[PDB]
Ligand binder design. Structure first.
Ligand code: NI
Ligand code: NI
Lengths: 79, 84
């Protein structure tokens, strides 16, 4: 049990989707920088990232244990 | 090479400008994304949405309009992609 907003599983070949919210552009930008660093280190890239000034939508495609662990590393970065 | 000189597309009910940029590698896409963040901070102008993968970036600009401030932002984004 935790207090993070859940990742939603959807689509025929399943995907994990989550919308992260931030209080300002600077907080969104700082998170996107840490998310880029995470993908660069791991070689694991979400299938899609899209963002505005106060939100980041992330979609992870089925490679599973590894997808859930990457979603947990992203949740840890958000807070 | 990919082509970055195509026109921005005008689309949607309150008009928006839309363009997709494609790159040959993650390094090139990432350099463009980092330069786009610097541009937004320089201008204080932020796209409505930036939507990307490892080899492409889709940008949507909203009406402040649409006027010349939005078109000038679009042209500076083209110059970051190598088109001027
Ligand atoms: Ni052409
Ligand atoms: Ni050519």
């Amino acid at each position: 049990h935790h207090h993070h907003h859940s990742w939603r599983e959807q689509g025929k070949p399943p995907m994990l989707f989550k919308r992260f919210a931030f209080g300002s552009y600077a907080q969104t930008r700082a998170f996107l920088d840490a998310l880029a660093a995470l993908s660069e280190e791991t070689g694991q890239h979400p299938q899609n990232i899209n963002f505005g000034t106060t939100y980041v939508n992330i979609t992870l495609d089925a490679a599973g244990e590894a997808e859930r662990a990457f979603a947990a590393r992203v949740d840890a970065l958000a807070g």
